[PDB]
Symmetry: C3
Subunit: 359 residues, 3 copies
């Protein structure tokens, strides 16, 4: 309430859970505050599964982006006349078009699987609508939805046999089954259909204090259609991502591992700062323009989805490179700041670092 921007790991409602994993949905952005009126049509989700488990055939009414935080996975993606399976490592992300049926296996025999989904509902702003093939209990099948009558006309079978075979959740699969599910899969390496790794192209910001990898529409067609960019950022224990703002981009920053705090600058003439402590599970939101600083307690990693990516431009307010402040003319530097121009131009050359520094 003292801060609207920081959605705590608790504020994730839990959709479904079993002895094999859970799908948890974040709090609807525009509810927390009227101020996030534009993110009303974007949802976050966390898929987590123990080893040798299977999220069964399912589709929804939302364009998905899955960003494999940790673990090894086999995502099998059904078209109507084709099917294509993919092995997924950390930093692999792929777009799941609304309507697409697909299932997710954790292939690692020890490691937990952890997947961060950005969802865009296409039917009503911010409402997700899932149709399970696995007509389990309490919830019957999407096929249960039809009538004995129609199900017969269609499948060309007595209802007794359909009811038996088809109608009568994340389940447990045998070690041998995951071999089969896998053996055939394609791997990442900016493709179309296949998955692509956030990190498998040089980072845009790299130094002794952190890494900044980021895939934009100008660099991946999957992302173009939705106008999003997906980024991963490492800030090494006891350091700093330097003050910066995104020209036009709104970020959903999520925390995969580490601890730390962020400082956001916001609000007429009443610039107010927004602090919060960061832990795994936690989200915050960087509305375009609002500048932000990120400090790491332990080894902190972040996963951000920028909305309105196309032509976004991230300007820093400190360090050597991309310090827009230092682009100001000397005479104008004089007026803007109490200090003299040779007194500004020297304090800006005090940080020899760029993008990241020390606490």
């Amino acid at each position: 309430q003292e801060n609207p921007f920081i959605f705590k790991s608790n504020r994730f409602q839990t959709l479904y859970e079993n002895e094999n994993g859970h799908i948890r949905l974040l709090q609807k952005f525009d509810k927390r505050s009227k101020i996030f009126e534009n993110l009303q049509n974007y949802r976050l989700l966390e898929y987590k599964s123990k080893p040798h488990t299977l999220f069964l055939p399912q589709y929804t009414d939302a364009d998905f982006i899955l960003v494999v935080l940790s673990g090894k996975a086999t995502l099998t993606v059904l078209k109507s006349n084709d099917r294509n399976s993919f092995n997924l490592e950390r930093g692999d992300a792929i777009k799941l078009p609304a309507g697409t049926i697909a299932y997710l296996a954790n292939r690692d025999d020890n490691e937990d699987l952890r997947v961060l989904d950005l969802a865009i509902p296409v039917n009503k702003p911010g409402q997700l609508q899932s149709f399970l093939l696995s007509g389990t209990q309490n919830q019957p099948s999407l096929l249960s939805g039809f009538s004995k009558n129609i199900l017969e006309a269609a499948f060309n079978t007595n209802y007794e046999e359909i009811e038996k075979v088809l109608l009568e959740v994340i389940v447990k699969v045998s070690r041998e089954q995951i071999e089969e599910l896998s053996k055939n899969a394609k791997s990442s390496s900016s493709s179309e259909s296949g998955p692509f790794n956030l990190r498998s192209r040089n980072p845009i910001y790299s130094n002794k204090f952190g890494k900044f990898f980021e895939i934009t529409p100008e660099k991946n067609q999957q992302l173009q259609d939705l106008d999003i960019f997906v980024n991963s950022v490492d800030i090494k224990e006891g350091s700093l991502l330097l003050p910066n703002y995104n020209s036009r981009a709104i970020v959903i920053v999520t925390v995969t591992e580490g601890k730390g705090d962020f400082e956001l600058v916001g609000q007429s003439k009443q610039v107010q700062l927004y602090r919060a402590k960061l832990s795994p599970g936690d989200v915050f939101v960087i509305p375009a323009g609002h500048p932000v600083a990120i400090n790491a307690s332990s080894d902190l990693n972040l996963i951000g989805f920028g909305i309105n990516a196309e032509n976004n431009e991230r300007n820093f307010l400190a360090g050597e490179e991309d310090n827009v402040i230092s682009q100001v003319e000397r005479p104008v530097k004089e007026l803007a700041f109490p200090g003299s121009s040779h007194e500004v131009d020297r304090l800006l050359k005090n940080q020899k670092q760029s993008y990241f520094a020390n606490a």
Copy 2:
């Protein structure tokens, strides 16, 4: 408490006279907050009797006309030009907001019927017409302007502007002499205007996507016509023969406003926490298939449907029955065994039972 069926009843008569009708379907978001994303789509029927003309008029809304039946001459004006078009069943053309046009039923015996997808430009889901044609209990758009502008404007005294243009019917009886003159020169549609950027296109002047002994599914994506590319709409025409079935299928991302042209039948829609929404279908009736919702449609008599599909680009339709595009029968052997009670072998055999595709016997 089925929000998806808009029975004919839900049409409001914008205008009626001895010569024709113009109906406007209920705002979709007025039915239910399910349809907040059909907010800015309106449907209208246009029916007019032989040898009648909807006089010049434009509207602050992009229109996609589909002639359902009868024979029309559609004249379209531009700031500086004019082009005539004779239209039959299945002929579809986009008329952009501001486009002055007029539409006469050139057939002698038969009525003319037309389904219109209106996309208002100025204020969500609210169209406004402008008439050149004027009366007295409805002065024309030019009546709008003051004397002082009308005289400056037209460089005529009010006495004659009033007499010649304004005063002393938005659908009027017209002669044979007149309707032949309107139609002379005017162009038809073809195959090499099934992707035309200008003229009308026929839904059926290229082969259907799905077709067997029980039904026919014609569909024009934006891919196959630039006119539908601006508004990201698709228009399909679907015939389901008496005692047959449009097999269970969903759209991946496209919302569809379905209208009934001729025939009777009924639909079953799976929604939400899982729910069957059904109802009988008669001509005039409209229902909505939300993206991802598996729909089935069943015909009692020879049935014809006109869908417009909002969010058309990248829309895959994935069927749940029969050989072809049956997504269920693409699940890796063992997952079928885990997903469905059945053995993988039992799943595979049942899916093979229906050897038909897209449409089937009921």
Copy 3:
């Protein structure tokens, strides 16, 4: 009674000193539900006295500047670059939201008038400004950070940061102004991807003895394309008149720059309604798509239109020789549509011999 005219005084003042000001016309949509689709567009006027300088700032809205009068030096910053532009009457430049820039009146006598169409990126109709300008009346955006981030970020003791950076329009010297003039490119001819374009560079779409109508569009210029906007500068001669015309699909935000005159708009509410208002420098009005509009001029009258939903717009006239859409109606239909005769209608339409603008 007429919700279309926004009198000059519906402009709220965001800031004002003895050097310039910044006004922000009230929300179109707060005026009326009628203008819902304009909810996300804001109008601003920047005025500034000679030898002044709106300090470095950025805003969460795409800015389309039209310079109404004055001379100026709009200086634009990227993360790692600076280009500056000498601007004059007609010069329009787009600033992406998140661009830091600073504008200066480089004239010694005439004030600087800019008309901004602002498009918030964050929350519909909501300008968040971010003053890099460090005072107490408006504490620098840098203020917001805690001593600790600040000391680490610049790697400097806090007492050299309070001192130097923290502790909006301002006066400036001739040698200072001459500085910003020294190496600063101009407009000319447009389609130049990132410079300024003059609204009167290309020839006017309509021009005669009674007015000029200049209009750049997404077609003619990539910068407009993105925001799908057109930008026109209509001139109308004293005792002359822009003949009744409607835009097919374009919602125009018309802003009277100088002169006086009146607009007739034809909306509804048996249906057709004449919406009227006298016009004067600062007055704004809205012309919804499809709504016919004539503009009279009491005195020589310039207008700056921001076309919204610009691509594929066709403006149709309803009087005069050219682009007159009524004269395209077939002869037997004129007979029918109008109470008079094919022939009588043909004559009345041939009576106005001028096109676009005419005498009153």
